[PDB]
Amino acid sequence: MKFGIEFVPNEPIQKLCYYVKLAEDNGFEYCWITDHYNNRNVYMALTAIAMNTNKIKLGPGVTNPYVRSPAITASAIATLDELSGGRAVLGIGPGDKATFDALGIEWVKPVTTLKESIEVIRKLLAGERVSYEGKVVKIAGAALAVKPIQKAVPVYMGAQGPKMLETAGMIADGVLINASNPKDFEAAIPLIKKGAEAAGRSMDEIDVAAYACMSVDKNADKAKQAAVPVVAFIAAGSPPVVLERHGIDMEKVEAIRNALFPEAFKNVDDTMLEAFSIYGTPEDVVEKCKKLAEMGVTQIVAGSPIGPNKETAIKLIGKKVIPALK
Amino acid sequence: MKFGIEFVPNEPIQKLCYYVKLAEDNGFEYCWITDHYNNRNVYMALTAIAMNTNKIKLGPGVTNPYVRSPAITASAIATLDELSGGRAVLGIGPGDKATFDALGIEWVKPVTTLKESIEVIRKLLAGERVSYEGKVVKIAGAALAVKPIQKAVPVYMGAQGPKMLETAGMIADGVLINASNPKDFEAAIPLIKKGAEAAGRSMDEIDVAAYACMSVDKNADKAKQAAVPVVAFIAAGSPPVVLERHGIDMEKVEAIRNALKSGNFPEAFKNVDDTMLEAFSIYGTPEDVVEKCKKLAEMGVTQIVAGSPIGPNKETAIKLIGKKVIPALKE
Ligand SMILES: C[C@H](OP(=O)(O)OC[C@@H](O)[C@@H](O)[C@@H](O)Cn1c2nc(=O)[nH]c(=O)c-2cc2ccc(O)cc21)C(=O)N[C@@H](CCC(=O)N[C@@H](CCC(=O)O)C(=O)O)C(=O)O
Numbered sequence: 001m002k003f004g005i006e007f008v009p010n011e012p013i014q015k016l017c018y019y020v021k022l023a024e025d026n027g028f029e030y031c032w033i034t035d036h037y038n039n040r041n042v043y044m045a046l047t048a049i050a051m052n053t054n055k056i057k058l059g060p061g062v063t064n065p066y067v068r069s070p071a072i073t074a075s076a077i078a079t080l081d082e083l084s085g086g087r088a089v090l091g092i093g094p095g096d097k098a099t100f101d102a103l104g105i106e107w108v109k110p111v112t113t114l115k116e117s118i119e120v121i122r123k124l125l126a127g128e129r130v131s132y133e134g135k136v137v138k139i140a141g142a143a144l145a146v147k148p149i150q151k152a153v154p155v156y157m158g159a160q161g162p163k164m165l166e167t168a169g170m171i172a173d174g175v176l177i178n179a180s181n182p183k184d185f186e187a188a189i190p191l192i193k194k195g196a197e198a199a200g201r202s203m204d205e206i207d208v209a210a211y212a213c214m215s216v217d218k219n220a221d222k223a224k225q226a227a228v229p230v231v232a233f234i235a236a237g238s239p240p241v242v243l244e245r246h247g248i249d250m251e252k253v254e255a256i257r258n259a260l261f262p263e264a265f266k267n268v269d270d271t272m273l274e275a276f277s278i279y280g281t282p283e284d285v286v287e288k289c290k291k292l293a294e295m296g297v298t299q300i301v302a303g304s305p306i307g308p309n310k311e312t313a314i315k316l317i318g319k320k321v322i323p324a325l326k
Numbered sequence: 327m328k329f330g331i332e333f334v335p336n337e338p339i340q341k342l343c344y345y346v347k348l349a350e351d352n353g354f355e356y357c358w359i360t361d362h363y364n365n366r367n368v369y370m371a372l373t374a375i376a377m378n379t380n381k382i383k384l385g386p387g388v389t390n391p392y393v394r395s396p397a398i399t400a401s402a403i404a405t406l407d408e409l410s411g412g413r414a415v416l417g418i419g420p421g422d423k424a425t426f427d428a429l430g431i432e433w434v435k436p437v438t439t440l441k442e443s444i445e446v447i448r449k450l451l452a453g454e455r456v457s458y459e460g461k462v463v464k465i466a467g468a469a470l471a472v473k474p475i476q477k478a479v480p481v482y483m484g485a486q487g488p489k490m491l492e493t494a495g496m497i498a499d500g501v502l503i504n505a506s507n508p509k510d511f512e513a514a515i516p517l518i519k520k521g522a523e524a525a526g527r528s529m530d531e532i533d534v535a536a537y538a539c540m541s542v543d544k545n546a547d548k549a550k551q552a553a554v555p556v557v558a559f560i561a562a563g564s565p566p567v568v569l570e571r572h573g574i575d576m577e578k579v580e581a582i583r584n585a586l587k588s589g590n591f592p593e594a595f596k597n598v599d600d601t602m603l604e605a606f607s608i609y610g611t612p613e614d615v616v617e618k619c620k621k622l623a624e625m626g627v628t629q630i631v632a633g634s635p636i637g638p639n640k641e642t643a644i645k646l647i648g649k650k651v652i653p654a655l656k657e
């Protein structure tokens with residue numbers, strides 16, 4: 001099993017550089033930084049991370065076709081790959097309606113715009129002159145001067161909806177799914193497989209990644225309790241099909257959505273902690289990851305909280321979780 | 327053949343970080359930075375270099391037991407290995423009398439000092455609490471809190487003389503020999519092998535490195551011209567044994583010795599001839615240099631250090647070596 005780590009660049013980048021180097025020392029293989037206009041800029045954070053790291057893969061987790069021209073994205077990814085000596089990965093997704101409303105941006109065909117941005121980004125990274133008259137994305141004679149070091153920078157798609165999961169199976173080198181429980185993947189992987197069989201691809205070409213809420217501590221209950229605030233936020237934002245897949249009292253969920261705080265947090269129960277987070281001792285967490293692996297998951301991203309204390313939990317994971325899971 | 331690159335940190339450290347990143351891009355595997363009190367500090371240079379690189383191995387080429395405590399050398403190396411994610415190498419040598427006469431440092435038994443220093447550095451790096459009552463190095467209760475990432479950081483000895491070569495066979499993970507010609511390695515690798523056999527070691531455990539003067543250019547004569555000033559210095563400093571081995575006109579040498587002594591660089595270079603260029607440098611076209619490196623591999627060289635001048639232009643030369651030399655010699 002491969003492990004990733006994710007951070008919002010909402011603290012001074014030096015602190016983030018410490019966490020990621022700590023993650024590299026502890027055998028994490030992927031570093032994913034969120035991209036939102038209100039936080040520190042993702043590529044500037046990835047530059048500093050690159051300079052403080054040596055082996056860990058890194059890149060946006062995830063950017064999108066809208067807040068920058070896909071041409072700019074491609075050139076940013078190439079710069080990162082150059083600087084890091086061939087370690088870049090491109091996490092890319094459609095974004096969200098709240099953002100583009102705020103920014104005055106049209107949320108044009110999410111699935112198509114993404115598919116086509118990705119095809120255009122792959123070609124520019126290959127050093128091709130690109131003339132591409134898509135439905136949404138339209139390029140005329142663009143070329144990069146900057147080159148990546150890798151022949152093909154991996155592209156990981158964020159996908160929650162059915163079409164995106166299938167579109168990912170057809171084009172993506174990997175898929176980031178905001179899920180933490182094996183049932184979420186029993187459903188979504190066939191949807192990716194459908195796309196992958198369609199396009200002639202084996203599932204060996206596709207890193208299915210669990211972008212999970214993790215919370216590991218030496219004390220099971222200290223760990224469980226660190227999970228609670230993120231779990232309460234998940235339950236709120238989940239669509240009913242997920243609510244029905246794991247069997248969640250929409251009663252609590254109206255009480256959590258409403259309370260949102262300590263009232264929101266009080267209504268979080270054990271079926272929700274089962275459903276939206278890998279929590280427990282290292283031995284509990286090692287077991288939950290084993291199960292996700294049987295379901296086709298090849299990367300687990302230890303998202304927030306990483307534990308009650310991120311620093312302590314990164315180290316605990318390095319000592320007692322990563323080596324037990326190959 | 328693995329390739330290394332050498333650099334004196336005598337320009338702003340950002341310029342050096344560019345050259346090393348460029349060498350990494352171009353497939354060089356080792357970066358060796360000299361350690362002399364008059365230039366930029368070797369470990370501050372290596373720190374910056376580590377932050378601008380990702381996979382090239384890096385270290386001092388070479389430090390010595392005298393200008394810092396060996397315990398300070400150990401923790402500096404551990405700090406480098408931590409920062410770089412496990413890429414450090416410790417190049418270490420006895421230093422030189424001229425420096426320690428300048429600095430008021432007694433050049434005590436260079437071979438026993440070096441062996442004892444290397445042994446203490448390794449025990450320190452292995453995390454041991456160290457009490458060591460050597461003939462020169464005496465340590466009581468010392469222990470590092472800083473830990474390397476590599477279980478064993480490699481130790482490369484710089485070695486020109488036969489007792490230093492023998493010692494390297496017994497204790498070193500690699501040997502940096504300042505020489506560019508197969509005749510030097512014919513003479514030296516038997517000496518290394520004797521120490522290895524005495525210590526019970528295979529020669530697969532030992533990276534024999536030619537710390538060479540290299541000058542490559544699409545134009546062989548331009549390459550040759552660029553190597554002269556460095557060759558002038560190597561001929562001048564060569565011990566007497568080395569110059570007869572290669573048949574250097576010893577009168578052309580003294581003329582080079584006086585000119586550099588006075589700082590008369592143009593007079594020094596006027597006295598360098600083809601015999602010293604073939605003796606003390608690897609020069610010419612990429613095809614020429616590839617052939618010369620194969621003749622070095624034949625004597626038992628497993629790393630070539632593309633030392634100064636690298637080429638007429640360092641930046642151009644690093645790229646040409648990357649494109650036309652390293653791939654040809656890559657097992
Ligand atoms: C757009 C939406 O896609 P979704 O897969 O359900 O959810 C998208 C999320 O993944 C998206 O919000 C991500 O960008 C969020 N995301 C982040 N978004 C950000 O931009 N920044 C972040 O840092 C970020 C982090 C993050 C981390 C992990 C991750 O797991 C995702 C991340 C959707 O509606 N998908 C539908 C497509 C429906 C649709 O849009 N149809 C249109 C277009 C179809 C076409 O024309 O091709 C139509 O009917 O015409 C589906 O899958 O069926």
Ligand SMILES: C[C@H](OP(=O)(O)OC[C@@H](O)[C@@H](O)[C@@H](O)Cn1c2nc(=O)[nH]c(=O)c-2cc2ccc(O)cc21)C(=O)N[C@@H](CCC(=O)N[C@@H](CCC(=O)O)C(=O)O)C(=O)O
Nearest residue numbers: 360361388419421435436437438484485486487488489490
């Ligand atoms: C001490 C001297 O050793 P040497 O092997 O000739 O030293 C030449 C170089 O290796 C040495 O000067 C290096 O430190 C110089 N050097 C630099 N030295 C620096 O300190 N900084 C540098 O950056 C540097 C760069 C460098 C790069 C490559 C390189 O290959 C050498 C480098 C010597 O005379 N050795 C003889 C005699 C050994 C000896 O001293 N025996 C004594 C001592 C006995 C005892 O100590 O126990 C005796 O028998 O009485 C021998 O090897 O046989």
